[PDB]
A = this chain, B = another copy of it.
């Protein structure tokens, strides 16, 4: 397991040591998660979510689950190879046959995913990639006779379409399209859904550049009694060229080749959805050639490059370097650039994902604030979701009243303003969700902060309704009286940040109003939530305070601690209680758990969070997004070593036991690693394998502004590093407001205070304030 191609890829060389590991790709309209053994999950937008490769049964509407189980007929991307001289077979990448291989590489790439495998002296290369703007998978297969004698082979792509629909499904070979076309009608019953579903891409295509010897479109006939392990159609000399008539369809082709010693051949295919044959052919003409593949690859590299971000690092930790330089920025960029491929992002996701873009393409951030605030309610309250398309609707959790949505506005805007200095966004005029009222961004923000001050009970604590940041914490306040400890403390943080902005803008009454606000809230928190060694989590509708030392499950939550540090409820006296409480009850080798001990049964004044399996998701996992709010809190009070230790725990490896236990390639941060570390040690640390998470925008922020300490201010670039003490030297390159800063950090026993040199001469203070677009500056930072 290691980086290759100068960081462009990361290679895993066993199909069994880490069998859940995967990587992803995306583009403007789709995403695909590819498992190391050949399984895959693909979703596209049209404009709502859909799939073209289906399960063999009628599946629920869903993308993936955490810790997704795969199974033999799970959708996947495979090539069977048959020795026509011996009848022996194997499959690439490893499933479905699972033969002994002589060689195996799975390569996660920034811009592609690929495998190299060998068996029976035949060398197989498989490469997947996507164009920027169309929904289609670009597949490249290379087969090489690696021996001294000719070899006769039958080569079979197997791209199973699955059970498409109970109403109508079929498939046939189309000579005109040049491959297989499966077709269905998405089930429905209401006449309105006919009109709504009319432009669905209900065909799935698998198209060949090179005409094959034969094909099979009927899944059962492909398998016969041999099943996937040894399909009958492959035991025969030739595929039988069957179709599917209200039978489960499949995409199987056959090439028969005699290959000379050392001879290699290449075959191209495309796979995806289409409205009709005409669209499949349009895509074929556009992509299915050496030239279409090359042009797509180079447009796609350029897209990834445009999102490369603002920080390259060179530290003594080569695993961190590789992760931060090569993998983190693409994962941030995915979130803000396509908003997790939903037409109704959760508001807090929209805002936090876009916060991350401040460091990548800040104009997308700016647009995101304008778009979100145009959907603010006239009361100042923000909706649970942001609609990205006319006609979309709030779905799933966005229909369940949660109360924290306004908080994110000044919290995330702060990052934007520090990075860009675009205080002028505050003067942009935007409407509200209803009414004829158009007001500046700044007036919107004021009304959001007033909303949060009004949405509090007689004690001055924030109402929780059916949840706050913790989506399934739904029964604390469902009767209309319960309050959140996390929301209270986070509200005080928000109010303090926004009061700073008001002061910076000469809005001095506002600055006072909101600072007073924050003091009131923190007082109420200190009176009603503080539990003696840590802050509690909320007070239920019936007046019980939970997240306290009296509770046997859910005894401490991370979030109220992190956010009391930030918002100022935690003073100098309280902070060391927090740190030790968190370390004793929540820290693990895989990072910090969000609550503990995990709940093992329903507690119905807290609610659905407590019914999740203990140590999964919000029920006490190492939930990385909560972990990173703690990291950030630690950085805000100079707890440099603690912060770095806990941040570095998010990245698996290089320890081999760690790698195997988490079962993840280190090419993304998952939403969680399994918690309940004390209750269930066997599974603890296991990765969810979910690449969708708002964690990464905060991780990137922590590195840039906190660890490396290269943070923007209205004066310029502020140098305030918090490197771990083990590093004798490190470098970073920072792109900032159109300039580049080559930074060298070095520990020196000759000094008492940090000393900063700019282009060799020493500065006073810690701000670089003469910044010209296009220039490069040498910074030397000497540290005690």
Contacts and interface: CB of A to CB of B under 8 A. Distances in A.
A4 interface: no
A194 B57 contact: no
5 contacts: A57-B71, A59-B60, A194-B607, A245-B683, A246-B613
Contacts of A16: 225
A219 B67 CA distance: 14
A616 B55 contact: no
A245 B616 CA distance: 10
A319 to B, nearest CB: 28
Contact of A57 (B59, B189, B680): B59
Contact of A74 (B57, B191, B397, B472): B57
A606 to B, nearest CB: 12
A472 B170 CA distance: 20
A665 to B, nearest CB: 19
A72 B72 contact: yes
A400 B188 CA distance: 12
Interface stretch (A161-169, A338-346, A437-445, A454-462): A161-169
Contacts of A604: 194
A475 B195 CA distance: 12
Interface in A589-647: 602, 604, 607-608, 611-613, 615-616
Given A69-B248, A191-B466, A247-B683, 14 more contacts: A57-B59, A65-B166, A66-B166, A98-B225, A167-B611, A167-B612, A168-B613, A169-B613, A170-B613, A190-B400, A191-B478, A229-B229, A245-B682, A246-B674
Copies of this protein in the assembly total 2
A310 to B, nearest CB: 37
* Max count, chain B CB within 10 A of own CB: residue among A245, A248, A466: A245
A248 B20 CA distance: 14
Interface in A276-300: none
Contacts of A573: none
A59 B227 CA distance: 22
A474 B59 CA distance: 26
A523 interface: no
Contacts of A615: 246
A613 to B, nearest CB: 4
Nearest to A183: B613
A193 to B, nearest CB: 9
A73 interface: yes
Interface string A51-65: 000011111101001
Given A69-B163, A73-B71, A225-B98, A616 B246 contact: yes
Interface in A460-492: 466, 472, 474-475, 478
Contact of A246 (B98, B166, B396, B683): B683
A69 B602 CA distance: 37
Contacts of A191: 466, 474-475, 478, 607
Contact of A67 (B65, B72, B246): B246
A433 interface: no
A228 interface: yes
Interface in A693-742: none
A58 B65 contact: yes
Contacts of A58: 59-60, 62, 65
Contacts of A248: 69
Contacts of A62: 58
A477 B189 CA distance: 15
A185 interface: yes
Interface in A656-684: 674, 680, 682-683
Contact of A71 (B56, B169, B188, B608): B56
Contacts of A474: 189, 191
Nearest to A475: B191
Contact of A168 (B59, B67, B189, B612): B612
Interface string A321-348: 0000000000000000000000000000
Contacts of A69: 56-57, 163, 219-220, 247-248
Interface in A188-218: 188-191, 194
Contacts of A170: 613
A693 to B, nearest CB: 16
Given A166-B65, A168-B616, A246-B615, A188 B608 contact: yes
B246 A611 contact: no
A356 to B, nearest CB: 27
Contacts of A475: 191, 194
10 pairs of A and B residues whose beta carbons are closest in the complex:
A246-B613, A56-B71, A168-B613, A58-B60, A65-B166, A185-B611, A71-B73, A69-B248, A246-B616, A245-B683
Interface in A78-118: 98
Contact of A397 (B189, B247, B682): B189
Contacts of A71: 56-57, 72-73
* Max count, chain B CB within 10 A of own CB: residue among A72, A227, A613, A616: A613
A189 B400 contact: yes
Contact of A98 (B227, B245, B611): B227
Contacts of A608: 167, 188-189, 194
A73 B396 CA distance: 29
Contacts of A98: 225, 227
Interface string A235-246: 000000000011
A283 to B, nearest CB: 23
Contacts of A56: 69, 71, 74
Contacts of A246: 67, 613, 615-616, 674, 683
A98 B231 CA distance: 13
Contacts of A194: 475, 602, 604, 607-608
Nearest to A73: B71
Contacts of A245: 613, 680, 682-683
